Design a protein around this ligand. Structure first.
Ligand code: CA
Ligand code: CL
Ligand code: CL
Ligand code: CL
Length: 306
C-alpha cells in the first residue's frame, strides 16, 4: 500500500516541509513548503535565538503539522542544523516545539546531514563503485564516501562560500591574486580528504545552477538537471566566466543565477573545480536531491527493515 512520509528541515534562514509518497519502492514528492523565518538573526552577536523568530518558526511548524495531519503522513522526521545548536536557548526552543506543535526536532551535525544527502543520492542516482558525494551549502561542504547505500566515512569541511568570499575576494570580482590565494587554501584543505573514487556526485545550489547554465535549462527543471554530467573543463570555463563578471551583473547576464547567490557563486564553483583536480577525476554527476529528500529515503528504509 502507498505510504506518505515527510521531512522538516529547520535552518538559520528557512523552515521547509517535504511530503512524498512511496508506491512500489518509488518515492515521488507531492508537497513542498518553505518559509523564511531567519532563526539565525543576531545569534552571532547575542548568542541567542530571538523571540520573534522563535514565535514565527513555531507558527510555521504548526501549519506544517496541520498539513501532515490532513495528508495522513505516516512517518515524519524533523531536523535542525548545527547553526541552531550554536544558540544558547536552542534547547528551550525545541522543548516549546515538543509541547506546542507535538513534534520532536533532532539537532543534527553537518556530518549527519551528509549521511542523509548520501542516501538521497543512493536512491535517486544509484552511482556505481566507490562514491564520494560532495554537498556544498549552509556554511560547509561535506565529503561522504561509500558504496551503494553504505556510508563508510564523512568529512565535513567548514569552507562556507560566504566566508571564503569575504576572506579572499576583497575586490568584486576578485583579482587574479585573490583567486590564487583562494585556490591555495582549497588545495591545503581538500588534499586532506582526497581518496580514490569511481564516481563523484555534486550537490547544492552552486552545482545545480551550473548544470542549468551548462545545459541551457531555463526555467530550472529538476528533470533536466538531475543526473547531468559536468566535466572539469566545463566547470573551469564557468569559473573563468564568473571571475570576469561583477556580482551585481551576474544574475542579469545569467538568469538562472539567483540574486542572493550571485556574489558567492564563484567560490562555490571553485570548490567543485578544485575537488575534481585534487581527486584526479574528470567529471561529476549532479544531484537535485540532498538532505531533505534523504530524510525521506531514510524513513522508507526504516519502514522496510525487519
Ligand atoms: Ca553542506
Ligand atoms: Cl560561510
Ligand atoms: Cl556553503
Ligand atoms: Cl549555495
Amino acid at each position: 500500500p502507498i505510504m506518505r512520509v515527510a521531512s522538516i528541515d529547520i535552518g538559520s534562514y528557512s523552515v521547509r516541509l517535504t511530503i512524498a509518497q512511496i508506491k512500489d519502492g518509488k518515492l515521488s514528492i507531492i508537497l513542498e513548503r518553505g518559509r523564511i523565518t531567519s532563526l539565525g538573526t543576531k545569534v552571532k552577536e547575542t548568542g541567542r535565538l530571538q523571540e520573534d523568530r522563535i514565535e514565527e518558526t513555531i507558527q510555521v511548524l504548526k501549519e506544517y503539522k496541520k498539513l501532515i495531519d490532513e495528508f495522513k503522513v505516516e512517518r515524519v522526521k524533523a531536523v535542525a542544523t548545527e547553526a541552531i545548536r550554536r544558540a544558547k536557548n536552542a534547547e528551550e526552543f525545541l522543548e516549546r516545539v515538543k509541547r506546542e506543535v507535538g513534534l520532536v526536532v533532532e539537532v543534527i551535525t553537518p556530518e549527519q546531514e551528509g549521511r542523509y544527502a548520501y542516501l538521497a543520492v543512493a536512491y535517486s542516482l544509484k552511482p556505481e563503485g566507490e562514491v564520494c558525494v560532495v554537498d556544498q551549502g549552509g556554511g560547509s561542504t561535506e565529503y561522504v564516501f561509500g558504496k551503494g547505500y553504505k556510508v563508510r566515512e564523512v568529512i565535513s569541511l567548514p569552507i562556507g562560500i560566504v566566508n571564503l568570499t569575504e576572506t579572499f575576494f576583497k575586490q568584486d570580482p576578485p583579482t587574479e591574486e585573490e583567486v590564487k590565494r583562494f585556490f591555495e587554501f582549497l588545495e591545503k584543505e581538500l588534499s586532506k580528504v582526497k581518496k580514490p573514487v569511481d564516481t563523484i556526485v555534486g550537490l547544492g545550489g552552486t552545482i545545480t545552477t551550473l548544470a542549468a547554465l551548462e545545459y541551457n535549462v531555463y526555467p530550472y527543471d529538476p528533470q533536466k538537471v538531475h543526473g547531468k554530467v559536468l566535466t572539469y573543463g566545463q566547470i573551469k570555463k564557468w569559473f573563468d566566466t564568473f571571475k570576469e563578471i561583477p556580482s551585481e551583473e551576474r544574475s542579469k547576464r545569467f538568469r538562472q543565477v539567483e540574486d542572493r547567490r550571485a556574489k558567492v557563486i564563484l567560490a562555490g564553483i571553485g570548490i567543485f573545480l578544485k575537488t575534481l583536480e585534487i581527486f584526479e577525476k574528470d567529471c561529476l554527476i549532479v544531484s537535485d536531491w540532498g538532505l531533505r529528500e534523504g530524510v525521506l529515503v531514510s524513513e522508507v528504509l526504516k519502514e522496510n527493515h525487519s
